[PDB]
Amino acid sequence: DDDDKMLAAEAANRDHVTRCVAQTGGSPDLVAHTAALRLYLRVPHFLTEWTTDPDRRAAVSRALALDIVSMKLLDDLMDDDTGLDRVELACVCLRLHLRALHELESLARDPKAVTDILEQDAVHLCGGQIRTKRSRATNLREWRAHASTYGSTFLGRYGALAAACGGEGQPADSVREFAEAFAMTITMADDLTDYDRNGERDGNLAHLMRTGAVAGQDVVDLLEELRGRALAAVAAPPGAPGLVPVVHLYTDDVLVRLLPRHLG
Amino acid sequence: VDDDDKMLAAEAANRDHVTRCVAQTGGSPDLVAHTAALRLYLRVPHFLTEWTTDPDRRAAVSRALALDIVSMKLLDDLMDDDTGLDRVELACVCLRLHLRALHELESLARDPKAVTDILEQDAVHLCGGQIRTKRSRATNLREWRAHASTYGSTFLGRYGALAAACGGEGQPADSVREFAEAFAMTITMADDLTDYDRNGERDGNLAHLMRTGAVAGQDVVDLLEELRGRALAAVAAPPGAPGLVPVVHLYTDDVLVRLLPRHLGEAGAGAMATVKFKYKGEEKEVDISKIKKVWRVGKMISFTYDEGGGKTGRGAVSEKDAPKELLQMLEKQK
Ligand SMILES: CCCCCCCCCO[C@@H]1O[C@H](CO)[C@@H](O)[C@H](O)[C@H]1O
Ligand SMILES: CCCCCCCCCO[C@@H]1O[C@H](CO)[C@@H](O)[C@H](O)[C@H]1O
Ligand SMILES: CCCCCCCCCO[C@@H]1O[C@H](CO)[C@@H](O)[C@H](O)[C@H]1O
Ligand SMILES: CCCCCCCCCO[C@@H]1O[C@H](CO)[C@@H](O)[C@H](O)[C@H]1O
Numbered sequence: 001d002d003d004d005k006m007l008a009a010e011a012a013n014r015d016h017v018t019r020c021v022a023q024t025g026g027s028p029d030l031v032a033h034t035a036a037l038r039l040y041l042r043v044p045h046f047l048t049e050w051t052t053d054p055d056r057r058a059a060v061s062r063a064l065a066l067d068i069v070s071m072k073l074l075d076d077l078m079d080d081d082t083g084l085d086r087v088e089l090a091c092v093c094l095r096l097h098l099r100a101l102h103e104l105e106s107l108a109r110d111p112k113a114v115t116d117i118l119e120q121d122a123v124h125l126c127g128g129q130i131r132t133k134r135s136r137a138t139n140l141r142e143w144r145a146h147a148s149t150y151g152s153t154f155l156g157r158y159g160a161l162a163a164a165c166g167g168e169g170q171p172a173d174s175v176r177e178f179a180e181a182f183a184m185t186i187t188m189a190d191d192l193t194d195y196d197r198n199g200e201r202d203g204n205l206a207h208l209m210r211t212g213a214v215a216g217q218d219v220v221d222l223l224e225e226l227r228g229r230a231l232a233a234v235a236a237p238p239g240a241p242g243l244v245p246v247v248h249l250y251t252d253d254v255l256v257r258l259l260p261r262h263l264g
Numbered sequence: 265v266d267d268d269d270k271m272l273a274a275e276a277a278n279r280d281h282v283t284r285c286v287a288q289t290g291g292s293p294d295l296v297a298h299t300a301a302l303r304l305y306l307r308v309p310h311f312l313t314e315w316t317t318d319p320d321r322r323a324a325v326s327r328a329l330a331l332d333i334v335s336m337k338l339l340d341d342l343m344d345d346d347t348g349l350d351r352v353e354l355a356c357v358c359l360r361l362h363l364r365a366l367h368e369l370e371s372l373a374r375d376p377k378a379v380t381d382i383l384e385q386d387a388v389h390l391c392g393g394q395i396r397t398k399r400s401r402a403t404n405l406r407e408w409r410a411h412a413s414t415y416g417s418t419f420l421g422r423y424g425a426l427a428a429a430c431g432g433e434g435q436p437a438d439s440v441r442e443f444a445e446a447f448a449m450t451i452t453m454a455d456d457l458t459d460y461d462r463n464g465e466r467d468g469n470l471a472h473l474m475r476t477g478a479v480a481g482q483d484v485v486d487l488l489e490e491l492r493g494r495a496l497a498a499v500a501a502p503p504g505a506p507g508l509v510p511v512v513h514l515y516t517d518d519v520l521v522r523l524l525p526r527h528l529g530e531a532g533a534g535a536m537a538t539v540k541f542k543y544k545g546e547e548k549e550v551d552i553s554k555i556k557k558v559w560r561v562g563k564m565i566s567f568t569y570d571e572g573g574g575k576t577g578r579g580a581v582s583e584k585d586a587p588k589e590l591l592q593m594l595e596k597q598k
Binding site: 098 | 351358
């Protein structure tokens, strides 16, 4: 079945990454940390679901996993909250990033697309990240705007990328619309998921919900808007019907299990 | 007075390109100032682009290279967290710059995959090297030179490799890179022996081991001379970049004249200077440090010196057998 395929890609992606981190000098502690980024290693699978060839699909999924983890380490490096070596973080981050550009470029119909896609909205992504951390959100409007950069544009670039290294007949705008909508659903999920790991403060949105600054129904509505946006994206021909239940799994998880944890 | 102009121009060009970029992306006036303060970093893309016959390709490559070098410096500052700068801005401006760097370099590259190829060839060597460099402080010239070969030579070598790759025709890849690796270690020593007092900034590893006697002034001198030669040669390789010759001497001699002395002493490197002569059937050897009066008669240098107690000794040698230290005391006195 399909869950079988997702589980295998996740394990292939995980191994491609930890092997890479280990051979560049990352300690057992950082290797385990990259292996703990489950959704980050899984999402590249959903992102390459319009890729016909299984071999090309596995190569693109992992190349993308290499850069997603890389950017996620960059993030942990700017926050300094993981208690992981500052040096190993930077070093591994750059190493994984260079490996990803290399693999992705060798799979792209045209190597220049990789960097065109990366530069296209780099300012949007980076400046938004600066904006986001600079000022907390005070209501759903601001949260959502901050989230379309660290969440949506971030994932959206990888969608664009998968389309571009995913061979022929990949509806590029559609893979990206899925990427950005899905990214926001899981970004909320994480913001609302507390793990108790050290100096990890309440997730902004979760706080806004418990404070009352953000309306419960309003979150529900956004969730629904994001489910529709993604279902529409995967319905567009040629289609990726296989992502349909995935969109539902994640959107329904936040509605059923995460929201009740924050009704303030 | 004309090349120095081209350099001054590339340096401002590169600076403006980088600061304009850091600002558009959101960095605070602090970080825009900091990147601006990276003089050498912004300037060196000029020397790497010296084999580029077409001036516009050159301006373009020089600045792309500037963007990445600064980006990499920012990531280093980000791992040290000693700058006082905001980590978020550092990280974000870091990535932004690098992405812009990638795009611009690939646009001028001879082959679509050259850039990512170069950047990947020795990523593990540079990245794993950086981790070792920082986990263990060096303790002898040998260990310093090995650390420096990665965060200095390897680091700048890639930018050399990239300069040749995006620099049109007439680029001797290997030479460009060997220049970069040699020159890089030179300025890296210079940075190391240069103190600035900003924050809790460490005396440079090498300057420390030098003031501790763990490293020999003459050895440092030798190493600089090795790097000056390695460089000079790389710029001699046809088609050649005659223009980097004065540049090579400029920086090398700077470390020798100004920097080295701040860490050694009254006695530079090597051994003390001596005069060897034959006096009253004897064989004498005097330290120029003991030579009092010294004058010239024909092609003979006659002198007097301190021979123990209030005992005044004399001598005379052909100018040919006179050490440069003595031959100078002539000009001080006459
Ligand atoms: C991921 C690319 C799209 C951007 C949205 C980021 C959401 C990722 C959240 O996933 C979860 O993150 C936790 C900590 O961040 C991990 O403890 C957990 O194992 C992982 O499953
Ligand atoms: C993650 C890969 C690491 C690549 C980035 C390394 C930084 C490149 C330049 O090195 C610089 O050398 C100077 C001279 O010693 C130091 O004063 C300075 O701090 C350091 O920035
Ligand atoms: C060029 C990358 C290769 C690494 C070799 C180190 C050269 C960089 C040293 O230059 C100087 O660094 C200082 C930071 O400590 C700045 O304050 C100063 O203005 C700048 O001119
Ligand atoms: C310089 C631009 C870098 C963009 C940032 C790339 C990483 C994006 C993932 O964001 C993640 O969002 C989660 C949900 O809120 C947080 O739990 C987590 O801490 C944070 O890592």
